[PDB]
Ligand binder design. Structure first.
Ligand SMILES: CCCCCCCCCCCCCCCC(=O)O
Ligand SMILES: CCCCCCCCCCCCCCCC(=O)O
Ligand SMILES: Clc1nc(Br)nc2nc[nH]c12
Ligand SMILES: Clc1nc(Br)nc2nc[nH]c12
Ligand SMILES: Clc1nc(Br)nc2nc[nH]c12
Ligand SMILES: Clc1nc(Br)nc2nc[nH]c12
Ligand SMILES: Clc1nc(Br)nc2nc[nH]c12
Ligand SMILES: Clc1nc(Br)nc2nc[nH]c12
Lengths: 346, 346
């Protein structure tokens, strides 16, 4: 079925730039959209100003979007649930405030869409995996793709992928998330692991992209970093049991090339400053997602025995004071090799 | 062997920006480098000025690079031959001036490296295929990857792939083209067809990237165009008998993402003007490579029965006056689909 689905209510848990942008997307497909945000005082400000002045400045919220600090009112009556709570707070949220939410989702069979990106430090688990400890996995999908929040929020043409182990679940979500003006287009896939890996690793590679710029390198270098870094996303995906079909799609290469070309982003400027020779302590006086991800990414790579050359060198630069030029020369000391891509056709 | 190879002489046939940049690369690996250019008066100017003032302004040529209008002196003693003659003049060159050159290359077993990109209008053949009508295919390699000429010419870090049916030939060329300071790095592959397809199609997609910008779309759109367009490079590669291992490497995605992000390039500005609604005749008052490639690309796609949605719509906009917004809506009238990538892992 290529016919779109419209709903009475959607709830978005998480009030960041991306969460708000998706609320904008859902406001064209659901009569009512609640965005949950824990601080009551800030919720009131946002509803009065008709604008997420904290994380999406300069964008007018649709009149059918309401911010709320009350979990129970947020999800009550919802026909789709989105999670964009940052990784570190996910488990705590379900433990402290998810009891009724979980019961409701279980009972009503409400589709859940995971948009959180990262790796949990204590378990080295990805967001949809964490959420799957609480909500039955058949209800779980992942959304990932090249999607700057501001472009998504103002309706500028965007393609994403929706991943689900059962393709038919992804296909239902496709009908819900895709807009009537074709401004937001969704492609179905099975590769939830690939999506989640790409989403986490892209942020670490975007620091490297910054390093390259601060070292004096140009766009050829950035293009090579993307291509070689994609192979590390692939190998980690394999080791984690993923089928890998998202790696070379919108969730993998698509989001990765966009994130690494984002010159004004926090990951990039942190990487640029490191490339220019500044120590991380001086840069740290919000944290860049790549900085946070690099340590548990390394720990996970080591546990699975997956070599991630670029990501490892980025970890060394960020966490272990390594000179970026020594890291570059270490990277380039492997000698001449084959590209390392299998043939597609026999 | 990871040890580099150094040579007495290299010859580069073709004096464009890219050809000159590669002469700069070879000047660090060969004692002598000749760059052939047919006009004697312009050859004299370039040698006096120590600068390709016609196609690489502002870059000082290495002292061991000599421009020449004499084919016989150009190749005499060369241990590697590069071709960067534009596609339309390739056959004519061999027919009119290649007789002795071919004999020499055959007799001395001199490696030939194809860097020309495009499709010949009369035969719908790719450059290495044309050259292979004259020089034995075992001597033939293709160079392709993300490589802006100016960045390559001034020694800024660049990775390319070298493709050859016999991987061992690619591996020898790898040792010749890779520089001692690791500023120019080469990766070996077998996928000559994929390289040549990517090289031709990227120029047509870069027009579309322009169209997207002129229509008001943003970076999310560009990222989606790259990803979907890569699938058209893949399908045309399959149909042509290529193994496809370069499609997702430096020659494919790598070069494609760089070319489509090149805002100041001729392909992009032509596409931008078309997106803003200007007719092609008004824009045409040099030709953009994407404009030239689009017609024979379509004819080749039709002959092989390969559907190339984006490329077809770009052809319609360029050649058949089609409104870019009707083309976009036609593209987006296919309904909701799966991403169309096979799993990597079972
Ligand atoms: C962590 C340093 C970041 C600097 C950015 C370098 C620019 C991209 C370099 C890509 C080439 C990587 C070569 C890897 C070789 C290997 O497989 O071990
Ligand atoms: C030729 C028009 C160029 C305008 C650029 C559009 C921006 C990228 C659009 C990518 C989505 C393409 C959808 C193709 C669907 C299909 O497989 O038929
Ligand atoms: Cl404790 C906590 N929980 C959630 Br959900 N989000 C937060 N943001 C800051 N602290 C937070
Ligand atoms: Cl998203 C969108 N934008 C413009 Br401009 N025109 C359209 N027509 C249908 N969907 C459209
Ligand atoms: Cl999504 C979309 N569709 C059409 Br038709 N035209 C556009 N121009 C910008 N975005 C557009
Ligand atoms: Cl006829 C001809 N041959 C070659 Br090689 N290059 C050219 N450039 C313009 N006309 C040309
Ligand atoms: Cl290409 C290159 N550039 C710089 Br800066 N330093 C180097 N050291 C070895 N190769 C190098
Ligand atoms: Cl190629 C290269 N190598 C090293 Br070490 N450092 C650099 N800085 C810029 N390019 C560089």
């Amino acid at each position: 079925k290529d016919e779109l689905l419209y709903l009475n209510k959607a709830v978005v848990f998480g009030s960041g730039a991306f969460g708000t942008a998706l609320a904008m997307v859902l406001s064209k497909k659901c009569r009512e959209v609640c965005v949950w945000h824990m601080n009551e005082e800030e919720v009131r400000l946002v509803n009065e100003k008709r604008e997420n002045v904290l994380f999406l400045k300069g964008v007018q919220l649709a009149s059918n979007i309401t911010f709320t600090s009350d979990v129970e009112k947020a999800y009550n009556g919802a026909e789709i649930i989105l999670f964009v709570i940052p990784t570190q707070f996910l488990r705590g949220f379900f433990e402290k405030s998810g009891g009724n939410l979980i019961a409701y989702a279980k009972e009503k069979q409400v589709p859940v869409l995971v948009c959180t990106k990262g790796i949990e430090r204590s378990t080295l688990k990805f967001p949809a995996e964490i959420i799957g400890e609480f909500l039955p996995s058949p209800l779980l999908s992942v959304l990932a793709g090249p999607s700057f929040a501001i472009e998504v929020a103002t309706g500028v043409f965007t393609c994403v992928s929706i991943a689900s182990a059962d393709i038919n679940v992804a296909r239902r979500l496709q009908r819900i998330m895709s807009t009537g003006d074709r401004s937001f287009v969704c492609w179905a896939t099975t590769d939830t692991v690939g999506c989640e890996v790409a989403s986490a690793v892209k942020n670490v590679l975007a620091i490297g992209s910054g390093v390259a710029n601060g070292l004096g390198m140009g766009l050829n270098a950035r293009a090579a970093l993307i291509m070689r870094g994609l192979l590390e996303i692939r190998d980690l995906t394999a080791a984690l049991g993923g089928d890998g079909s998202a790696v070379f799609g919108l969730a993998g290469l698509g989001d990765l090339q966009l994130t690494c070309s984002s010159e004004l982003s926090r990951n990039f400027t942190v990487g640029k400053k490191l490339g220019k020779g500044l120590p991380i302590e001086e840069i740290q006086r919000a944290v860049a997602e790549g900085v946070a991800t690099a340590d548990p990414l390394m720990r996970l790579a080591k546990q699975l025995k997956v070599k991630m050359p670029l990501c490892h060198q980025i970890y060394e630069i960020v966490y272990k004071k390594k000179n970026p030029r020594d890291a570059l020369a270490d990277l380039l000391s492997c000698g001449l090799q084959d590209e390392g891509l299998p043939p597609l056709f026999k």
